[PDB]
Design a protein around this ligand. Sequence first.
Ligand SMILES: CCc1[nH]nc(C(=O)Nc2ccc([C@H]3CNCCO3)cc2)c1C
Lengths: 58, 338, 240, 285
Amino acid sequence: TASIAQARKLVEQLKMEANIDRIKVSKAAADLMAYCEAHAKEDPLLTPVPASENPFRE
Amino acid sequence: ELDQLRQEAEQLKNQIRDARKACADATLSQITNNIDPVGRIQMRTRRTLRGHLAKIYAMHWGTDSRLLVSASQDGKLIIWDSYTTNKVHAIPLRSSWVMTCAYAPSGNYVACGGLDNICSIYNLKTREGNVRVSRELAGHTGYLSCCRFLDDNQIVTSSGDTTCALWDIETGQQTTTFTGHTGDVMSLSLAPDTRLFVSGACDASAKLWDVREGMCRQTFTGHESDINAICFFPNGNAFATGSDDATCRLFDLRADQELMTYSHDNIICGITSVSFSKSGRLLLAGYDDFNCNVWDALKADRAGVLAGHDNRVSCLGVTDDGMAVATGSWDSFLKIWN
Amino acid sequence: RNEEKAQREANKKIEKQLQKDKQVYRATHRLLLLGAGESGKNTIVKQMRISGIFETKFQVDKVNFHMFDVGAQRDERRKWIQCFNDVTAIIFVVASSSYNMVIREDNQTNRLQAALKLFDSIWNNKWLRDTSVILFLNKQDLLAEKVLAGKSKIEDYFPEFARYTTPEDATPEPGEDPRVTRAKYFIRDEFLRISTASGDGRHYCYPHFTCSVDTENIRRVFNDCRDIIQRMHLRQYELL
Amino acid sequence: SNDVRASLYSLMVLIILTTLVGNLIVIVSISHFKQLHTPTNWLIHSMATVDFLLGCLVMPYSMVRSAEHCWYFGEVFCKIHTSTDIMLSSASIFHLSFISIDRYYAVCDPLRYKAKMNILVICVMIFISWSVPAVFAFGMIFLELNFKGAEEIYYKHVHCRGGCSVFFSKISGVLTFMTSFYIPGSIMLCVYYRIYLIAKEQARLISDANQERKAVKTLGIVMGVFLICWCPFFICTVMDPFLHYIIPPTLNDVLIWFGYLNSTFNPMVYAFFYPWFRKALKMML
Ligand SMILES: CCc1[nH]nc(C(=O)Nc2ccc([C@H]3CNCCO3)cc2)c1C
C-alpha cells in the first residue's frame, strides 16, 4: 500500500543516513576555534576600527 | 508488513542514536571557558531608513554591499542605496502579501514571494528605464516563505506545501523538487560552495539537501518549537538555527551532532532572525523584545544589547565583509547599526 | 555634482509617488473573509460583484472595501494568521443548514460542531484580539424547508433543542412559519455562547440571518464596520 | 503687611514653576516618539508650546506688578506685554476648540476619520490658530483700537491699577466677548454633548447585551476646568463697562490669575489624563 511504500522509503533513507562517515566533535570544535582566532585579526564591527575610515561618517 | 517496517525503522533509529552517542565523547565548554572573553561590546545606530507603509517583512543585501531591497506588507518592493540613504527603485506588486526578498549576485534580478504562491522575477536593467516582471513562477500550492538565487538562471524556492523546489528561470519548470519534512518550511540558506543548502520546518527538524543528487543528505533535530530563522556559517562547516522557544542553536555538518546552544533566563519571546559576522566571532539575533540581543559565538555570553526598535524584529542582515548590520522591524524602519 | 543631483531628483520623485500610494492605502478598509467549505462564499462575493488567494474590491457608499478571500495558505496551519492582525473585521461565514450530519472534513466532526471548534479557535487566538468577528449565517431558507417537514430534526445529533424555548428577542417581522424561529435562534445562541468566554471589551460579535442570495449582504457589512470603529474610538478617550 | 506679599510671591513662584515643568515635559515627550506622531498629537504639542511661551515670557513680568501694586518700567514694554498676553491666551482657546472639533470627527464619523483629518488640514488648523489671534492682538493694541475713546476713563483706570493695564470699551468689549468666548464655548458644549449622548447609548447597548460613568466624569473634568477658569473673567469684563466701571482692582488681578491657572492646568487634562501618554512617560523612566 501507500503506507507500506512510504515506510519502506523512510527505512531506506535511514539506512542511507546510517552509511555516513563519523567525524569526532573535538576535531570540528578545534577547526572552528582555529578559524575564529585566525580571522579575529581583521574582525570589523568588533575591533576598535578608526572613525575616519567608516564611510557612514556619523 | 507494516509492523515489520515499523520495527526495522525503530531498530535503525536505535542504531543511529547509539552511534551518535558513541561519537559524542567531547565538548567545547571547558576549552571555550579557557579562552579570553571578548569583553564589553556596544554599538550605536548610524543611519535610519524609512518610507515604508506597513510592517517590513524581509530584507536582503547586494554583493556591492551598498544597495539593498525591502518588502512591505503594503505590496512595495523598494531598492535602497544605504551609503547615501536614498531610494533608487520602487516596484509595486500584484499580491499585497509578500514575505520574501532576494537580490541577484549579477545585480540585475530581484525576486519576491508570499501567499500568492507565485515567485516573480524582475529585470532591473532593461532597454526601457522602468523595471518589469521578467517571469512568474507557478506550481507551489502553499505560501512562499523565502527565495534565493543560486545563479543568474537558477533559483531555489521554499513553500508552505512542506516541499521545496529548484527552478530554471529560462524554461520555467519545477525541476529538482526536494520532498520531505512533515510541517511547513519557513527558512532557507545557501552555501558559498553552491552545492548544498539547509531548510527548516515547523516540526523542529532541519534537512541538509545536496542540489546535484536531488535528494535528502543530512538531518538535524533538537528544538522544541517551529524553526523561525536559519543562517549558515561563513566557513561552511556550521549553521545557526533560531526557534520560538527563546533558544538559538549552532550545529556542525561534519560532526552531525547537536552542538552547543544558548540560553538566558531573562527572555521568553521567540527569535525571528539570526545572522553571523565576517569572522564569526559574534552572532546577532532579533527577538520580540524589540531589540537585537547579540551573543558571543564561543562563550555563549550576552556581550552587548542593541535597542532602538519599538516592535517585533522580523529581519536582520550582515553584509558580506562584516562591515555593518541592518535591522528591520514591524515598525517599518530599517536601521543600520555599527 | 550632476550625478548626485540626478540621484536626489530620482529619490524625490520616488517619495512623491509613494505619498499618493500612502493616501490611497490609508483611505480604504481591509476585511478578512474566512469561511467554511460547505458555506457558500462564492455566492456572496458574486453578489458584491454586481493564484490561490483572491481579492474582491467594492465600495458600499463611499468607503473602499477589500475582501481577502484566502484560498492559498496551508489549511492546517496558523503561521499565515499573524499576517492579519491589522484588519478591521473578519467576515466569518457559516451557513445555517447542516444537510443531515455532514462533516466539514474527514477527521472533523459534524458541521454544527466543526464550525463551533473553528469559531472557538479563531476567537481565543492571541494574535487576533483586537478584531471584531462578524458571523454571517447563510442557507437559511434551505434550513426553513429542511426542518419544516420534521424528518431531519435537530435532535439527530443535538440532545438539546427539546428543552429549548424561544427568547423574547425573537422578532420575525414578516411572520413566516414561526416554528423555524426556535431553531434559528438556537443555532444563533450556541454561536453567541462562545463569544462571552474571552469577551473583555476588546472584540465583539455580530450575528446575522441571510437567506440564499440578497443584495443586503453588502449594506450590513458597512453598518457593522461603522459600529466597530466607534467603540474603538471610545476606549481611547475614556468615554466608553 | 510683608507676610501677605511673601505669600503671594511664593504662590506665584509655585504656579510659574508648575506650568513651566508641565509644559516642558509634554513638549519633550511628544517631540520625539515615533509611536505617537498622530496629527492630534501635533495639536497637543502646539498647545504645550504656546502655554510654555506664555509661562516663560509673560507671567513673571505681571508677577511683580500685582505684587507691589506698581510698575517698574514703562515706556513701550508694557505695550508688547499687553499685546502678547492677548495673543497667547487666544491661541490657547482656539487650540482647545480645534481639539474638540477633531474629537467630534473622531467619534461621530468613525470610518471617514483618516480621509479627512490628515496632516494637511491639521497644519491649516495650527496656522489659523497661530495667525488670526496674533494679527488682531498686535493691531488693536498698537493702532490704539482697544478703547477708541473714553480717554479720561482709560487714563484714570490705568493709573489706578498700577501704571499699565488691559482696558476695554463698550463696543470693543462686546466684540471681544462675542468673538472669543461665544463660538469656542458653544462649539465645545455642543460637540461634547453629542459625544455624551452617543457614548450613553453605546454603553446602554453593551450593558443590556452582555448582562456612562466614565463619559460623565471625563466631560465633567474638561468642561469644569474650562468654564471655572475662563467664564468669570469674561463675564465680569463684559458686564463691567455697562456698570460705570465700579470694580476694585483685586478682582481684576484674581480674574487674570484664573486665566493663568487655566494655562497651568491645560496640559494635565489633555495629556496627563490618558493611559497611553502616561505609559510612554513611564516607559522613558
Ligand atoms: C482672535 C479673535 C479675538 N479678538 N479679540 C480677542 C480677545 O480680546 N481675546 C482675549 C483673550 C484673553 C484675554 C485676557 C487673557 N489674560 C488676561 C488678560 O487678557 C483678553 C482678550 C480674540 C481672541
